């Protein structure tokens, strides 16, 4: 006789019939039985021992929920609300939000707490957190129209006072509440309905989750999953624009395409699938080829090989750029593709001078001047960059090692 | 009812081991599949975790004692271990994890 029961012993058969009529939703029996019963009691007596309102909301009966919500003696009403938001029933949620005691905000002690203690959904979760947690758009919209905004996670390192108070004797549930609210702000429903524009808040919150993934050693997988969900929200939002006006509002926002820092910020924060999209790739090619369209439409990379072979000769382009700017070749020489073909080509003639120096004074001086040009290019490169940023790339090291060995 | 014992002949177990044979092992692994499931484990006893561990190692022993049906005893013991893991996973407070 070790079995556990919610009620000590099954008591009333009449109240048990009331519960069996509230479970399967027999409205006339509970309507006729509302008035003529001795008292309307919280029945429980189940495996989970839910109330009649709770048991009726679990199964979606709107008429018996409306009938019970007028009894005024009910309990667990808030717990029934979090349950109905979990199940995703909109009619029941709006019928409960108009109940008494729910005027103004009730959101954000002795509330919910079904069966005398030990409520569900972690006891730190308010209605809106569970609403955006389940991706319920209508319910999130109704709760936001009533003015329930999610609280901020606060800060990880900041002790403050109440955060330090809840860090001792409450511990290990503090991180659970942190990642719970963070799962709250990170979902498409709250991101789209909450703010003025989604994309800015989504990017900023994405890099913040990326920082708090590394700051906290535990739960790093989960923070990774939330940040990735956010990045996918942004990618999915840019994917849905069918016109150039909308793609320019998503990419740039408020000399080609001036004031483009948002893509710069997107590659700074390492959003992978935002910059790889076909629309964004089309934009960046439009800025990448720029003044020269003829090669943008060119047939094969072999024509680009002949183009890099004809760009190999310095004297024409260098003499032009030095003596006069802003010619036709002056407008062309300023461009994203031309600096690339010229830089790469001159690298190839450096290799060629290496091979011809090896096969059999002048080659010496030329190669020396070339590695001096490389070390000056690394002067201008390391100028703008802090020692840590310069050393971030493994290859950015090996390059300096190469030119240094040449100097030695 | 309990599975009784594999090696013990007793009287009624020996009576059902002859002329009833090959259905005796079927009844054994059938009842063992009975005690091994989350419903009976959670509702049956005072605490689930102790009975689940003890029954898990007992199924691990009877997997090696009996050469046949070793795969199925392995599956039942693994189902039990997963019941315990799933039960420890659901505690949201330090008091409950302790």
């Amino acid at each position: 006789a070790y079995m556990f029961s919610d009620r000590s012993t099954s008591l009333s058969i009449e109240e048990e019939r009331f519960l069996d009529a509230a479970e399967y939703g027999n409205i006339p029996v509970v309507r006729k039985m509302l008035e003529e019963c001795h008292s309307l009691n919280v029945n429980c007596v189940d495996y989970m021992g839910q109330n009649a309102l709770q048991l009726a909301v679990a199964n979606e009966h709107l008429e018996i929920t409306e009938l019970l919500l007028k009894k005024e003696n009910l309990s667990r009403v808030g717990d029934a609300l979090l349950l109905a938001i979990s199940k995703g029933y909109v009619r029941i949620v709006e019928a409960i939000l108009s109940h008494p005691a729910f005027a103004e905000g009730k959101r954000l002690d002795d509330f919910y707490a079904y069966d005398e203690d030990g409520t569900r959904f972690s006891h730190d979760v308010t209605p809106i957190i569970l609403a955006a947690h389940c991706q319920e758009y209508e319910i999130v919209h109704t709760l936001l129209r009533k003015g329930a905004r999610i609280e901020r996670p606060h800060d990880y390192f900041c002790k403050c006072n109440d955060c330090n108070q809840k860090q001792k004797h409450d511990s290990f549930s503090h991180s659970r509440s942190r990642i719970n609210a963070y799962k709250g702000l990170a979902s498409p429903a709250y991101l789209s309905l909450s703010s003025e524009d989604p994309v800015m808040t989504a990017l900023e919150l994405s890099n913040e989750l990326a920082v708090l993934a590394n700051i906290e050693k535990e739960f790093k997988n989960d923070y990774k999953k939330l940040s990735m969900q956010c990045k996918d929200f942004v990618v999915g939002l840019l994917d849905l624009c069918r016109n150039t006006e909308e793609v320019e509002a998503i990419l740039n926002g408020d000399h080609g395409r001036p004031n483009l820092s948002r893509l710069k910020l997107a590659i700074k924060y390492e959003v992978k699938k935002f910059v790889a999209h076909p629309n964004c790739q089309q934009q960046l090619l439009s800025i990448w080829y720029e003044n020269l369209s003829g090669l943008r439409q060119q047939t094969m990379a072999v024509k680009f090989l002949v183009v890099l072979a004809v760009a190999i000769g310095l004297p024409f382009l260098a003499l032009i750029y030095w003596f006069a700017p802003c010619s036709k070749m002056g407008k062309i020489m300023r461009g994203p593709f031309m600096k690339f073909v010229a830089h790469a080509a001159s690298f190839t003639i450096f290799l060629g001078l290496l091979v011809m120096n090896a096969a059999d004074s002048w080659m010496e001086m030329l190669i020396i001047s070339w590695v001096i040009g490389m070390i000056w290019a690394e002067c201008k490169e390391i100028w703008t960059q802090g020692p840590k940023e310069y050393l971030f790339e493994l290859w950015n090291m090996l390059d300096f090692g190469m030119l240094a060995i040449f100097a030695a | 009812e309990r599975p009784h014992d594999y090696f013990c002949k007793c009287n009624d177990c020996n009576q059902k081991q002859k002329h009833d044979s090959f259905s005796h092992s079927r009844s054994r692994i059938n009842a063992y599949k009975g005690l091994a499931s989350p419903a009976y484990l959670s509702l049956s006893s005072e605490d689930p975790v102790m009975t689940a561990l003890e029954l898990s190692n007992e199924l691990a022993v009877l997997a090696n004692i009996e050469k046949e049906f070793k795969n199925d005893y392995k599956k039942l013991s693994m189902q039990c271990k997963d019941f315990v893991v799933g039960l420890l996973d659901l505690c949201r407070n330090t008091e409950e994890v302790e």
Binding site: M48 | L43, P48, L87, L90, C91, E95, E96
Partner: peptide
């Protein structure tokens, strides 16, 4: 005592969670 109460809370959570997990999986033509 406290231990028994905690066991009741854990068993209740596990039963309800198990019924939700049963709900979440597909359909039966029957």
């Amino acid at each position: 005592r406290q231990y028994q109460k905690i066991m009741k809370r854990l068993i209740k959570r596990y039963v309800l969670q198990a019924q939700i997990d049963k709900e979440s999986d597909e359909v039966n033509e029957g």
